[PDB]
Amino acid sequence: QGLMQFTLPVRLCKEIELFHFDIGPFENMWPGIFVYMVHRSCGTSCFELEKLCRFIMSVKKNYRRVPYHNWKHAVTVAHCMYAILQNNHTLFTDLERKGLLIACLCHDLDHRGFSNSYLQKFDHPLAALYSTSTMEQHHFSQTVSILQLEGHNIFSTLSSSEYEQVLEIIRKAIIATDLALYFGNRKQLEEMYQTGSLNLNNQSHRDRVIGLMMTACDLCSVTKLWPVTKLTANDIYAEFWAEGDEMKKLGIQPIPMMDRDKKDEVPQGQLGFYNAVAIPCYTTLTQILPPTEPLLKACRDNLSQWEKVIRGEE
Ligand SMILES: c1ccc2c(Cn3nnc4c(N5CCCCC5)ncnc43)cccc2c1
Ligand SMILES: [Mg+2]
Ligand SMILES: [Zn+2]
């Protein structure tokens, strides 16, 4: 029917509302977690259940078994968007609620565990098709593909216009997950906020703010309980070191972040990353959207955990 509420066990029903929720090690629970979130974030109405499930499963099929950029990441990034949307209920459009959780689930579709840099140095065909934001244009493209499979059009109820608006929100959202673009995006959002020019009625300004949300969900492994934060950092380094290995195979010394012989330098690299990227992201995000403050506090706690690791205090 449409009298078919999804529900979660008590500890999950309560903790899922919190920014620092971990979706856990039971792969088979993640789909239902996503639907739960769509239904609460959007409504039981916004998507035909049978179509949703078929889409979610095809998206899952199209994530690979890489250590980090995998289906678990997909659903983790959707959950942080869910927490932001639920703490800023009245700021977002009907179309924005629909399209943003879907953008997040799709945002790393068919990722191979290599940076856009590697694609470019290897001379991968995707580098020729898409010169900038290489994987990000691929992920958008794979999303549109899965939307076009029979029985997969979860947007079928929208008007011709709604449809192009929602697919334009997803495309920008997914493009924004390219961290090379984050720096300029946040610097402009910072000056807009501080000269008071920021105006959520300017589509151009919304666009930037959704981009920043996108970066903030994407990095949300820096906002978890220390033991999640630490064990997730291992997964991302396993991709970085394999890429370092492949750079070496093309005859290129990798940066030390990616050199698995320079493992000692992880803790100081996380510091640099928290200082250069994460802290500034969640800072500007908290200024624009005050109820997202717990992501900043959690990030700062984790920074301080990484300083303890350097000081040999663990
Ligand atoms: C720009 C890009 C990377 C930089 C790095 C590399 N670095 N380290 N961690 C990450 C990362 N995750 C988020 C997920 C969990 C752990 C951190 N996502 C992307 N790049 C990362 C170090 C210093 C400055 C940087 C500037
Ligand atoms: Mg990505
Ligand atoms: Zn991602």
Residue with CA closest to ligand 1 atom 3: 273
Q: What is the dihedral of CA 143, 285, 309, 66, to 10 degrees?
A: 0
Q: Is 181 helix (H, G, I), strand (E, B) or coil?
A: helix
139 annotated binding-site participant: no
Resolution number, Å: 2.3
Residue 10 lies in a domain: no
CATH number for the domain spanning 49: value is 1.10.1300.10
Closest ligand to residue 215's CA: 3
Q: How many domains does the chain have?
A: 1
Please list the alpha-helical segments (H only) found in the chain. Answer: 10-15, 30-41, 49-62, 71-87, 94-106, 116-122, 125-129, 134-147, 160-176, 179-194, 203-218, 226-250, 266-273, 279-288, 293-310
Residue 54 lies in a domain: yes
Cβ contact 8:16 at 8 Å: yes
The 10 Å Cβ neighbour count of residue 301 is 16
Question: Dihedral of CA 243/28/7/14: which sign?
Answer: negative
Domain enclosing residue 296, as ranges: 29-311
Q: How far apart are CA 41 and CA 213, in angstroms?
A: 16
Residue 18 lies in a domain: no
Residue with CA closest to ligand 1 atom 26: 273
Q: How far apart are CA 251 and CA 242, in angstroms?
A: 14
Which atom of ligand 1 is closest in space to residue 233's alpha carbon?
Answer: 16
Q: Which of 277, 299, 305, 309 to mutate to test the pocket of ligand 1 (most atoms within 8 A of CB)?
A: 277
Encoding tokens for residue 158?
């929208």
107 annotated binding-site participant: yes
Residue 13 lies in a domain: no
Radius of gyration of the chain (CA): 19
Only one residue has tokens 């009245």, namely 90
Catalytic residue list:
69
Q: How far apart are CA 225 and CA 19, in angstroms?
A: 10
Residue 111 lies in a domain: yes
Q: How far apart are CA 123 and CA 301, in angstroms?
A: 40
- Residue-by-residue DSSP string for 220-253: GGGSS-HHHHHHHHHHHHHHHHHHHHHHHHHT-P
Cβ contact 67:237 at 8 Å: no
- Residue-by-residue DSSP string for 250-295: HT-PPPGGG-TT-GGGHHHHHHHHIIIIIHHHHHHHHHHSGGGHHH
Distance (Å) from CA 147 to ligand 3 centroid: 20
Q: How far apart are CA 258 and CA 117, in angstroms?
A: 12
Residue 3 lies in a domain: no
Question: Dihedral of CA 263/264/269/274: which sign?
Answer: positive
What approach was used to elucidate this structure? X-ray
Only one residue has tokens 């093309």, namely 250
73 annotated binding-site participant: yes
Q: How far apart are CA 247 and CA 269, in angstroms?
A: 19
Ligand 1 pocket at CB < 6 A:
179, 219, 221-222, 232-233, 236, 257, 269, 272-273, 276-277
The amino acid occupying position 155 is: F
The amino acid occupying position 306 is: W
Encoding tokens for residue 239?
């991709």
